[PDB]
Amino acid sequence: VKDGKTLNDELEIIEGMKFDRGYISPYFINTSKGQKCEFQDAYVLLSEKKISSIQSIVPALEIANAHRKPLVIIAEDVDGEALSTLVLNRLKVGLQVVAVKAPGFGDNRKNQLKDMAIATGGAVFGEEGLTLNLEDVQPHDLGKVGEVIVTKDDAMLLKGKGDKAQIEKRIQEIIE
Amino acid sequence: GQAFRKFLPLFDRVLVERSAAETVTKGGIMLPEKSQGKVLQATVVAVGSGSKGKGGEIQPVSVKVGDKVLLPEYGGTKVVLDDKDYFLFRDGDILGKYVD
Amino acid sequence: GQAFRKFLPLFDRVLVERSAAETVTKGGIMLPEKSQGKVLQATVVAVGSGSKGKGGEIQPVSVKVGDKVLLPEYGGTKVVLDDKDYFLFRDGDILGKYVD
Amino acid sequence: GQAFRKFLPLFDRVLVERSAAETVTKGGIMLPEKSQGKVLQATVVAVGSGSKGKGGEIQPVSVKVGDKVLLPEYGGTKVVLDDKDYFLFRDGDILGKYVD
Amino acid sequence: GQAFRKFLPLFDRVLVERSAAETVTKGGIMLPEKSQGKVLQATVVAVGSGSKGKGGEIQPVSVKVGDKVLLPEYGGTKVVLDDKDYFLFRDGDILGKYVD
Amino acid sequence: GQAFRKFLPLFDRVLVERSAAETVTKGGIMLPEKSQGKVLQATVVAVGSGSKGKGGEIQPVSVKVGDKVLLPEYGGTKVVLDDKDYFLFRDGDILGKYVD
């Protein structure tokens, strides 16, 4: 229950996975009518660590470009060389890519990223336990979403192509 | 010694030009210019006469003009010839050659 | 001198490749990658012609291609050949040989 | 040069093993292990061929395998041979030998 | 050696004068004098007799008076001759010559 | 070389023992042990074979066993032989001898 700005009550239903992190740079906007980045049938690359180097972002973009599919990178932060590479490939050749910060502050951020991985059918990179690296990325390690909408203040993933058994198992783990 | 752009290196110095930095990856991904470091591959364009390591004679440099060489990270002097970048090394600074 | 992947070391430099890092212990206990230091065992894959230690002649390097060698902790130069790691040392840097 | 556990030192390097640390005094009092410094007495187990100090010939190392020598505190390189500690010095690092 | 303005450098020292700083660009744009650094191009005006690199004879310097040379950034000594600037280098410091 | 307590110095090293510290003054005044510094007078008890300063032959050490010599303040290595203090120097470190 929150404050409304109108005279009457309204009910809003937030479907899918929506979190309060927008795009990192404003150059990823492709739909100017709402100032948002909208992709359909997009790959999803999830990183538990920050992406700031060239070698940690080239092969994911090579997979996206070879498969001719949009890429959404959800990480702790994309900055520096990797961010400049993303913006340069976006503006010059027209590469369908967007970069979003990972929501949460602490263990909840890791848990939310793992939930996104299970929902989308991808793998979390840069983790402590398993130590999967962004230099070695295969197409099966990337999640698949039917729809993604990224505005300035929030990101939203719709109809992720994960395994239903994985999702039920994660839900039961959350319940326990 | 062999000259180039009317420039002749003295002693055992070798004048090379660095190979062109790679702008796109093998998967067609464009790279930023500021993220491209100094290219350690070069081709030899000028050679000096050579120092006198032994007594009485001039030792020639181990590289000739046209050799593909691998440069070290440090040890090169910037030289501008007809508004174009070139680098001057010592003969012993050069790590190795690419022979074909 | 002997070349390798069309790369020939200059002077007394020796090009080796480090042995593969051990991933499991002798009882089947998996090791983290970031806890694996640089492998000091290597095999020689390329040798330079050799410097001129005495007057008038070339001293050959004390190791040939195919020798198993023990590298020191410091003194190796990173060399990338066909997207693969290799290391360049001076001939006097190598500690010892594994004979068989 | 002489090899040892199929390891041969290069140049004038000498491979030794440090003697066993004394655990009890002469009056039968046990000592803590962490209070035992590096044992400076050693026996020579491997010798290199030797460098070329003069022109044209190889100078042999001044110590042979089986000599007990007195090691300096600093200057030895750790070498692991068949899961056992060994130390690699230069020939001139060695202070002296015990003759019997 | 050859003297200049009643000044003869000793040993392998070379006295040059730096070329005049470029005041206007090729497009007609004048430059501030404080932004013009040291001109590395110079002409050789005096040479020394040379040192004795080998035994018993004097090695002459590799440059002669009138040679256009490229100086390094550091390593010169200011010499004032008849209220005019000149710079004294060692022979090995000069990077190369411009031969026409 | 000459051995002492079954210890032979290698190369040009010289093993001495420091002379006994003076406990009383010449007028019968006793001195604290802490205020007594290292005694720079010593007697030579062991000599090495000597290094090879010139080409082809061994240079003997300038001091023999039994020479009383003056030691420098720094440069001596502690050597324990049969629970007794001894000091190992290089041949050039010793300042002078007292001849009688």
XYZ file of C-alpha atoms in Angstrom:
676
model
C 0.000 0.000 0.000
C 1.482 3.344 -1.036
C 0.648 6.993 -1.632
C -1.286 7.756 -4.789
C -1.003 11.066 -6.619
C -4.570 11.050 -7.982
C -7.999 11.439 -6.390
C -9.003 7.773 -6.746
C -7.430 4.484 -5.718
C -5.676 2.419 -8.349
C -4.380 -1.151 -8.449
C -1.147 -1.920 -10.298
C -0.078 -5.504 -10.977
C 3.653 -6.008 -11.534
C 4.125 -9.229 -13.523
C 7.343 -11.042 -14.390
C 10.616 -9.902 -12.866
C 10.837 -6.134 -12.406
C 13.565 -4.513 -10.329
C 14.574 -0.941 -9.572
C 17.722 -0.710 -11.715
C 17.594 1.039 -15.080
C 20.068 1.210 -17.921
C 23.654 2.109 -17.109
C 24.143 4.479 -20.048
C 21.352 6.363 -21.867
C 22.738 5.327 -25.285
C 20.933 1.953 -25.197
C 17.566 3.608 -25.917
C 15.956 2.244 -29.081
C 12.301 3.197 -28.469
C 12.246 6.977 -28.063
C 8.489 7.155 -27.401
C 8.888 6.032 -23.788
C 12.671 6.530 -23.527
C 13.229 2.812 -23.039
C 15.097 -0.164 -24.478
C 12.738 -2.915 -25.665
C 13.991 -6.274 -26.917
C 12.241 -9.474 -27.973
C 13.835 -12.952 -27.811
C 16.938 -11.696 -26.010
C 19.922 -13.455 -24.493
C 20.631 -12.683 -20.834
C 24.142 -12.613 -19.353
C 24.236 -12.572 -15.552
C 27.396 -11.595 -13.669
C 27.838 -11.767 -9.898
C 31.042 -9.715 -10.297
C 31.592 -6.417 -12.084
C 32.421 -6.279 -15.796
C 35.099 -3.679 -16.523
C 37.508 -5.428 -18.925
C 37.470 -6.097 -22.658
C 38.151 -9.845 -22.517
C 35.278 -10.416 -20.077
C 32.720 -8.905 -22.479
C 33.916 -9.751 -26.035
C 32.851 -13.452 -26.317
C 29.317 -12.830 -24.997
C 28.887 -10.092 -27.609
C 30.366 -12.437 -30.226
C 27.747 -15.067 -29.342
C 24.964 -12.454 -29.475
C 26.205 -11.093 -32.823
C 26.674 -14.554 -34.357
C 23.190 -15.674 -33.303
C 21.711 -12.265 -34.318
C 19.966 -11.909 -30.967
C 19.797 -9.042 -28.458
C 21.842 -9.200 -25.265
C 20.910 -7.978 -21.780
C 23.811 -7.838 -19.327
C 22.783 -7.766 -15.668
C 25.837 -7.284 -13.468
C 26.969 -5.541 -10.302
C 28.327 -2.760 -12.530
C 29.420 -2.339 -16.141
C 31.965 0.469 -16.346
C 35.075 1.646 -18.141
C 36.384 -0.359 -21.082
C 33.467 -2.806 -21.276
C 30.912 0.013 -21.064
C 32.688 1.990 -23.798
C 32.766 -1.157 -25.948
C 29.022 -1.687 -25.415
C 28.216 1.926 -26.332
C 30.558 1.901 -29.349
C 29.027 -1.278 -30.757
C 25.540 0.094 -30.035
C 26.033 3.419 -31.841
C 28.275 2.486 -34.781
C 27.143 -0.912 -36.090
C 23.806 -1.041 -34.248
C 24.432 -3.891 -31.832
C 21.337 -4.826 -29.820
C 22.685 -4.683 -26.271
C 21.662 -3.187 -22.927
C 23.404 -3.181 -19.541
C 21.609 -3.121 -16.176
C 22.907 -3.102 -12.607
C 22.054 -6.050 -10.385
C 19.466 -5.162 -7.717
C 19.983 -5.744 -4.022
C 22.704 -4.969 -1.479
C 24.492 -8.066 -0.162
C 23.383 -11.704 -0.108
C 19.962 -10.659 -1.435
C 21.643 -9.438 -4.634
C 23.272 -12.842 -5.188
C 19.986 -14.605 -4.388
C 18.058 -12.390 -6.819
C 20.646 -12.975 -9.553
C 20.393 -16.740 -9.025
C 16.586 -16.462 -9.191
C 16.920 -14.611 -12.507
C 19.284 -17.360 -13.708
C 16.790 -20.091 -12.838
C 13.860 -18.168 -14.374
C 15.718 -17.423 -17.622
C 17.586 -20.726 -17.895
C 21.042 -19.154 -17.759
C 24.038 -19.333 -15.456
C 25.489 -16.822 -13.010
C 29.060 -15.765 -13.811
C 31.737 -14.505 -11.439
C 30.422 -16.453 -8.457
C 32.346 -17.478 -5.357
C 31.402 -21.170 -5.095
C 31.582 -22.468 -8.653
C 33.926 -19.787 -10.145
C 32.520 -19.559 -13.660
C 34.359 -16.962 -15.729
C 33.097 -14.466 -18.301
C 35.980 -15.301 -20.656
C 34.540 -18.799 -21.222
C 30.900 -18.310 -22.242
C 28.856 -20.828 -24.227
C 25.401 -20.112 -25.727
C 23.722 -22.503 -23.271
C 25.074 -20.503 -20.306
C 22.954 -17.497 -21.343
C 19.363 -17.087 -20.247
C 16.629 -16.480 -22.791
C 13.793 -13.982 -22.347
C 10.855 -13.484 -24.661
C 10.653 -9.822 -23.701
C 12.727 -7.224 -21.861
C 11.900 -3.570 -21.131
C 14.555 -1.306 -19.605
C 13.624 2.225 -18.574
C 15.706 4.830 -16.741
C 14.687 3.640 -13.265
C 13.662 -0.016 -13.647
C 14.208 -3.191 -15.653
C 11.651 -5.871 -16.482
C 12.066 -9.410 -17.825
C 9.067 -11.261 -19.282
C 8.612 -14.961 -20.201
C 12.078 -16.274 -19.450
C 12.927 -19.613 -21.052
C 13.939 -21.497 -17.919
C 13.124 -25.022 -16.841
C 9.822 -25.354 -14.990
C 11.268 -28.011 -12.670
C 14.173 -25.682 -11.807
C 11.718 -22.870 -11.045
C 9.473 -25.053 -8.862
C 12.560 -26.369 -7.044
C 13.793 -22.819 -6.390
C 10.296 -21.827 -5.206
C 10.196 -24.751 -2.763
C 13.693 -23.823 -1.553
C 12.478 -20.262 -0.922
C 9.463 -21.697 0.949
C 11.664 -23.852 3.196
C 73.675 0.544 -42.352
C 70.411 0.919 -44.271
C 68.619 4.278 -44.234
C 64.893 5.005 -44.468
C 62.998 8.302 -44.939
C 66.483 9.862 -45.220
C 67.207 8.699 -41.659
C 70.072 6.386 -40.706
C 70.329 4.919 -37.181
C 73.700 5.171 -35.487
C 75.523 2.265 -33.800
C 73.391 -0.845 -33.076
C 70.020 0.927 -33.051
C 67.098 -0.484 -35.052
C 64.222 1.649 -36.353
C 60.870 -0.139 -36.641
C 57.247 0.822 -37.208
C 54.582 -0.704 -34.988
C 51.916 -2.858 -36.620
C 48.411 -1.445 -36.958
C 46.241 -1.924 -33.878
C 43.351 -4.353 -34.256
C 40.068 -2.429 -34.337
C 37.518 -5.252 -34.674
C 37.656 -8.694 -33.108
C 37.357 -11.955 -35.042
C 33.600 -11.934 -34.381
C 33.184 -8.424 -35.758
C 33.047 -6.506 -32.465
C 34.430 -2.968 -32.608
C 37.007 -2.055 -29.935
C 37.631 1.345 -28.327
C 40.816 3.102 -29.388
C 41.856 3.989 -25.823
C 41.635 0.317 -24.781
C 44.180 -0.647 -27.469
C 47.652 -0.880 -25.962
C 50.941 -0.501 -27.778
C 51.336 -3.099 -30.526
C 54.370 -5.240 -29.691
C 54.608 -6.527 -33.284
C 56.641 -4.448 -35.721
C 58.582 -4.539 -38.972
C 62.188 -3.403 -39.280
C 62.565 -0.421 -41.603
C 66.079 0.847 -40.753
C 69.240 -0.687 -39.278
C 72.402 0.882 -37.919
C 75.954 -0.014 -38.865
C 76.451 -1.871 -35.594
C 78.644 -1.381 -32.531
C 82.087 -2.962 -32.016
C 81.545 -5.791 -29.546
C 84.886 -7.448 -30.296
C 88.242 -5.810 -30.929
C 88.878 -4.201 -34.306
C 85.708 -5.032 -36.269
C 82.078 -3.942 -36.468
C 79.431 -6.418 -35.339
C 76.389 -6.233 -37.649
C 72.882 -6.091 -36.239
C 71.049 -9.415 -36.052
C 68.021 -8.028 -37.938
C 67.720 -6.640 -41.459
C 65.148 -4.299 -42.984
C 61.836 -6.049 -43.614
C 62.008 -8.492 -40.698
C 58.878 -8.983 -38.621
C 59.963 -8.605 -34.989
C 58.398 -8.766 -31.534
C 59.032 -5.668 -29.442
C 59.396 -5.429 -25.660
C 56.986 -3.306 -23.649
C 59.655 -0.745 -22.696
C 62.784 0.443 -24.463
C 61.590 2.308 -27.544
C 62.282 5.924 -28.455
C 59.649 7.880 -30.380
C 60.936 9.195 -33.733
C 58.871 11.304 -36.148
C 59.721 10.905 -39.848
C 57.587 12.766 -42.428
C 54.798 13.145 -39.830
C 54.673 9.415 -39.081
C 55.446 7.434 -35.941
C 58.521 5.201 -35.724
C 60.360 3.633 -32.809
C 64.083 3.229 -32.156
C 65.332 0.264 -30.114
C 68.670 -1.273 -29.298
C 69.626 -4.447 -31.144
C 69.559 -6.552 -27.973
C 66.159 -5.203 -26.941
C 64.378 -7.143 -29.704
C 62.849 -10.345 -28.335
C 62.504 -12.379 -31.520
C 61.747 -12.641 -35.220
C 58.814 -14.080 -37.156
C 60.483 -16.136 -39.896
C 58.614 -17.579 -42.879
C 68.378 -21.530 -33.777
C 65.149 -23.538 -33.841
C 61.841 -21.788 -34.534
C 58.372 -22.644 -33.246
C 55.029 -21.529 -34.745
C 57.128 -19.351 -37.077
C 58.726 -17.529 -34.145
C 62.499 -17.512 -33.675
C 64.048 -16.166 -30.446
C 66.881 -13.691 -30.841
C 70.303 -14.046 -29.147
C 70.314 -16.359 -26.081
C 66.580 -16.288 -25.356
C 64.653 -19.534 -24.820
C 60.916 -19.876 -25.475
C 59.121 -22.418 -23.275
C 55.544 -23.336 -22.421
C 54.567 -23.870 -18.799
C 53.309 -27.308 -17.795
C 49.588 -27.697 -17.166
C 48.519 -26.777 -13.642
C 47.446 -29.632 -11.385
C 43.685 -29.504 -10.810
C 43.144 -32.496 -8.496
C 45.345 -33.868 -5.742
C 46.634 -37.445 -5.628
C 43.533 -38.577 -3.704
C 40.891 -36.875 -5.847
C 40.482 -33.470 -4.177
C 39.601 -30.667 -6.593
C 41.689 -27.464 -6.375
C 40.551 -23.879 -6.989
C 42.051 -22.250 -10.066
C 42.968 -18.966 -8.352
C 44.973 -20.865 -5.706
C 47.188 -22.406 -8.419
C 50.396 -20.422 -8.805
C 52.587 -20.222 -11.874
C 53.873 -23.650 -12.901
C 57.671 -23.650 -12.701
C 58.049 -26.783 -14.853
C 58.219 -26.224 -18.597
C 59.305 -27.755 -21.881
C 61.580 -25.941 -24.317
C 59.902 -25.265 -27.657
C 62.203 -22.643 -29.231
C 65.871 -21.684 -28.856
C 67.780 -18.660 -30.081
C 71.039 -18.762 -32.003
C 72.991 -17.735 -28.913
C 75.002 -14.682 -27.885
C 78.778 -14.261 -28.305
C 80.283 -14.809 -24.866
C 83.827 -15.272 -26.168
C 85.536 -13.414 -28.992
C 84.711 -14.316 -32.585
C 82.243 -17.200 -32.184
C 78.650 -17.816 -31.124
C 78.026 -19.669 -27.872
C 75.073 -22.063 -28.282
C 72.307 -22.199 -25.705
C 72.657 -24.945 -23.101
C 69.132 -26.306 -23.723
C 67.493 -27.663 -26.865
C 63.873 -28.020 -27.953
C 62.080 -30.782 -26.062
C 64.035 -30.446 -22.816
C 62.085 -30.388 -19.573
C 63.315 -27.433 -17.525
C 62.676 -25.843 -14.140
C 61.911 -22.137 -14.418
C 62.572 -19.481 -11.766
C 59.729 -17.518 -10.211
C 60.630 -14.258 -11.983
C 62.194 -13.332 -15.315
C 59.757 -14.559 -17.992
C 58.257 -12.478 -20.789
C 54.721 -13.289 -21.930
C 54.478 -14.197 -25.636
C 51.228 -15.012 -27.460
C 51.524 -17.386 -30.435
C 48.323 -18.547 -32.189
C 46.287 -17.514 -29.113
C 48.370 -19.589 -26.695
C 50.602 -18.630 -23.783
C 54.386 -18.974 -24.012
C 57.241 -17.535 -21.979
C 60.618 -16.136 -23.025
C 63.608 -16.400 -20.675
C 67.298 -15.697 -20.852
C 69.414 -18.843 -21.129
C 71.078 -18.206 -17.767
C 67.709 -17.815 -16.042
C 66.750 -21.504 -16.331
C 67.643 -23.343 -13.133
C 67.983 -26.946 -14.274
C 67.065 -29.768 -16.632
C 65.081 -32.968 -16.107
C 67.098 -35.707 -17.815
C 65.666 -39.121 -18.688
C 77.490 -32.626 -14.407
C 75.932 -35.144 -12.012
C 72.146 -35.575 -11.840
C 70.002 -36.484 -8.838
C 66.387 -37.746 -8.924
C 66.699 -37.118 -12.683
C 67.367 -33.416 -12.086
C 70.525 -31.798 -13.447
C 71.518 -28.241 -12.452
C 72.521 -25.917 -15.260
C 75.757 -23.864 -15.339
C 77.583 -23.558 -11.972
C 74.505 -24.167 -9.814
C 74.778 -26.685 -6.963
C 71.799 -28.591 -5.545
C 72.067 -29.550 -1.864
C 69.780 -30.796 0.882
C 69.808 -29.124 4.276
C 70.726 -31.302 7.235
C 68.171 -32.408 9.803
C 67.287 -29.814 12.426
C 68.368 -30.684 15.958
C 65.282 -31.474 18.041
C 66.846 -32.160 21.463
C 69.828 -30.636 23.234
C 72.870 -32.587 24.392
C 71.254 -32.816 27.839
C 67.953 -34.183 26.577
C 65.709 -31.098 26.342
C 63.246 -30.920 23.452
C 63.156 -27.804 21.275
C 60.147 -26.150 19.605
C 60.027 -26.613 15.844
C 59.240 -22.938 15.162
C 62.362 -21.901 17.111
C 64.551 -23.883 14.677
C 66.020 -21.696 11.955
C 67.308 -22.860 8.604
C 70.079 -25.440 8.978
C 73.212 -24.003 7.368
C 74.940 -27.396 7.045
C 74.170 -29.381 3.911
C 75.351 -32.228 1.713
C 75.830 -31.824 -2.033
C 73.540 -34.060 -4.080
C 73.758 -32.538 -7.589
C 76.322 -30.435 -9.465
C 76.045 -28.521 -12.713
C 78.488 -28.617 -15.602
C 79.904 -25.234 -14.617
C 80.078 -21.875 -16.379
C 82.888 -20.659 -18.664
C 84.957 -18.324 -16.502
C 87.908 -18.261 -18.900
C 87.873 -18.273 -22.689
C 87.070 -21.491 -24.528
C 86.732 -24.024 -21.691
C 84.265 -24.977 -18.968
C 85.281 -24.363 -15.363
C 84.093 -27.233 -13.132
C 82.331 -26.556 -9.853
C 84.549 -26.574 -6.770
C 82.321 -29.106 -4.958
C 81.331 -32.660 -5.856
C 78.343 -34.773 -4.862
C 78.689 -36.082 -1.312
C 80.566 -33.117 0.156
C 79.208 -31.517 3.298
C 79.277 -27.730 2.994
C 78.252 -24.706 5.035
C 75.456 -22.745 3.413
C 74.840 -19.003 3.613
C 71.617 -17.772 5.175
C 70.389 -16.064 1.987
C 70.773 -17.161 -1.627
C 69.124 -20.590 -1.962
C 66.262 -21.450 -4.296
C 63.624 -23.923 -3.116
C 63.333 -27.010 -5.354
C 60.828 -29.841 -4.827
C 61.981 -33.266 -6.054
C 59.708 -36.271 -5.356
C 57.934 -34.320 -2.578
C 61.157 -33.455 -0.748
C 62.887 -30.160 -0.032
C 66.143 -29.271 -1.811
C 68.000 -26.002 -2.256
C 69.856 -24.640 -5.272
C 72.800 -22.260 -4.814
C 75.540 -20.803 -6.949
C 79.017 -22.302 -6.720
C 80.477 -19.121 -5.221
C 77.692 -18.724 -2.666
C 79.041 -21.743 -0.767
C 81.193 -20.678 2.185
C 83.271 -23.797 2.812
C 83.332 -27.571 2.983
C 83.993 -30.042 5.792
C 86.832 -32.441 4.950
C 87.375 -35.776 6.704
C 89.328 16.444 -33.823
C 87.746 19.511 -35.423
C 87.242 22.708 -33.430
C 84.537 25.367 -33.681
C 84.622 28.995 -32.458
C 88.002 28.338 -30.778
C 86.482 25.420 -28.846
C 87.641 21.818 -29.235
C 85.727 19.123 -27.311
C 87.755 16.353 -25.713
C 87.427 12.544 -26.030
C 84.202 11.283 -27.697
C 82.241 14.497 -27.089
C 80.266 16.114 -29.919
C 79.260 19.787 -29.963
C 76.043 20.546 -31.868
C 73.556 23.386 -32.139
C 69.836 22.683 -32.055
C 67.714 23.568 -35.068
C 65.516 26.654 -34.883
C 62.147 26.132 -33.220
C 59.127 26.110 -35.516
C 57.186 29.323 -34.889
C 54.313 28.965 -37.378
C 52.496 25.817 -38.427
C 52.074 24.628 -42.013
C 48.606 26.222 -42.106
C 49.670 29.711 -41.033
C 49.009 29.391 -37.287
C 51.599 31.026 -35.040
C 52.716 29.151 -31.944
C 53.587 30.426 -28.457
C 57.272 30.235 -27.617
C 56.661 28.710 -24.175
C 54.891 25.735 -25.801
C 57.890 24.943 -28.038
C 60.133 22.402 -26.326
C 63.713 21.455 -27.059
C 64.384 20.848 -30.753
C 65.871 17.362 -31.056
C 67.216 17.990 -34.568
C 70.711 19.466 -34.598
C 73.759 20.006 -36.778
C 77.221 18.866 -35.725
C 79.617 21.806 -35.495
C 82.513 20.289 -33.513
C 83.877 16.807 -32.834
C 86.427 15.459 -30.397
C 89.381 13.230 -31.179
C 87.561 10.237 -29.693
C 88.245 7.818 -26.865
C 90.253 4.570 -26.980
C 87.674 1.793 -27.112
C 90.245 -0.803 -28.173
C 93.837 -1.251 -27.053
C 96.461 1.163 -28.353
C 94.495 3.266 -30.862
C 91.975 6.109 -30.797
C 88.464 5.392 -32.049
C 87.122 8.320 -34.111
C 83.610 9.598 -33.518
C 80.922 8.296 -35.871
C 79.717 11.799 -36.818
C 81.512 14.645 -38.573
C 81.009 18.403 -38.688
C 77.986 19.338 -40.786
C 76.012 16.149 -40.145
C 72.317 16.592 -39.415
C 71.616 14.446 -36.338
C 68.730 13.552 -34.034
C 69.446 14.212 -30.364
C 67.887 12.415 -27.395
C 65.687 14.306 -24.959
C 68.171 14.213 -22.060
C 71.945 14.043 -21.820
C 73.207 17.355 -23.198
C 75.427 20.016 -21.631
C 74.895 23.732 -22.221
C 77.940 25.500 -23.707
C 77.917 29.245 -24.410
C 80.292 30.277 -27.212
C 80.356 33.969 -28.228
C 76.985 34.502 -26.488
C 75.240 31.725 -28.417
C 73.756 28.410 -27.319
C 75.417 25.081 -28.109
C 75.016 21.601 -26.670
C 77.649 18.980 -25.915
C 76.816 15.261 -26.000
C 78.643 11.968 -25.836
C 79.063 10.225 -29.188
C 76.979 7.223 -28.120
C 74.063 9.461 -27.122
C 73.174 10.607 -30.660
C 70.335 8.469 -31.994
C 70.854 8.778 -35.741
C 71.789 10.844 -38.772
C 69.860 12.341 -41.683
C 71.704 11.312 -44.854
C 70.959 12.968 -48.198
C 94.105 -24.659 1.218
C 94.575 -25.321 4.935
C 91.752 -26.795 7.016
C 90.950 -26.132 10.673
C 88.532 -28.073 12.922
C 87.799 -30.163 9.797
C 86.618 -27.020 7.989
C 88.122 -25.846 4.696
C 87.191 -22.393 3.340
C 86.228 -22.303 -0.316
C 87.699 -19.898 -2.913
C 89.491 -16.825 -1.463
C 87.755 -16.872 1.928
C 89.806 -16.647 5.135
C 88.658 -18.033 8.494
C 89.977 -16.199 11.562
C 89.195 -16.119 15.265
C 88.805 -12.772 16.992
C 91.289 -11.929 19.732
C 90.087 -11.958 23.334
C 88.396 -8.759 24.480
C 90.311 -6.676 27.010
C 88.575 -6.882 30.391
C 90.819 -4.682 32.562
C 92.583 -1.458 31.672
C 96.330 -0.970 32.067
C 95.881 0.556 35.533
C 93.659 -2.192 36.894
C 90.148 -0.913 36.104
C 87.594 -3.525 35.048
C 85.285 -2.987 32.084
C 81.653 -3.945 31.403
C 81.155 -6.690 28.836
C 78.486 -4.686 26.977
C 80.851 -1.747 26.399
C 83.448 -4.037 24.771
C 82.906 -3.935 21.015
C 84.039 -6.420 18.408
C 87.801 -6.974 18.564
C 89.282 -6.079 15.175
C 92.505 -8.025 15.816
C 92.450 -11.674 14.784
C 94.663 -14.639 13.976
C 94.237 -16.581 10.739
C 93.330 -20.215 11.376
C 92.144 -21.366 7.925
C 92.771 -20.281 4.326
C 90.956 -21.146 1.123
C 92.548 -22.338 -2.097
C 92.020 -18.933 -3.695
C 90.024 -17.675 -6.670
C 91.314 -17.353 -10.254
C 92.067 -13.666 -10.731
C 94.105 -14.197 -13.898
C 93.414 -16.660 -16.692
C 94.302 -20.318 -16.200
C 95.833 -20.387 -12.705
C 94.789 -20.108 -9.065
C 95.824 -17.004 -7.141
C 96.816 -17.871 -3.551
C 95.494 -15.861 -0.631
C 97.834 -13.158 0.659
C 97.629 -14.422 4.266
C 98.682 -17.757 5.741
C 97.497 -19.597 8.839
C 99.009 -18.024 11.946
C 99.200 -14.444 10.666
C 97.845 -11.865 13.070
C 95.705 -9.454 11.050
C 93.506 -6.384 11.459
C 89.840 -6.946 10.558
C 87.300 -4.408 9.288
C 84.208 -3.628 11.337
C 81.770 -5.070 8.775
C 81.970 -7.986 6.365
C 82.514 -11.058 8.541
C 80.353 -14.173 8.522
C 79.751 -16.009 11.798
C 80.917 -19.649 11.721
C 80.487 -22.025 14.676
C 83.061 -24.835 14.877
C 82.951 -27.215 17.877
C 80.859 -24.691 19.858
C 83.332 -21.857 19.275
C 83.107 -18.542 17.443
C 84.964 -17.969 14.168
C 84.640 -15.436 11.376
C 84.913 -15.849 7.609
C 86.047 -12.930 5.430
C 87.070 -12.387 1.845
C 90.800 -12.040 1.218
C 90.491 -8.414 0.110
C 88.532 -7.403 3.210
C 91.484 -7.770 5.608
C 93.184 -4.406 6.099
C 96.689 -5.490 7.080
C 99.015 -7.833 8.936
C 101.226 -7.415 11.991
C 104.660 -8.802 11.089
C 107.261 -9.759 13.696
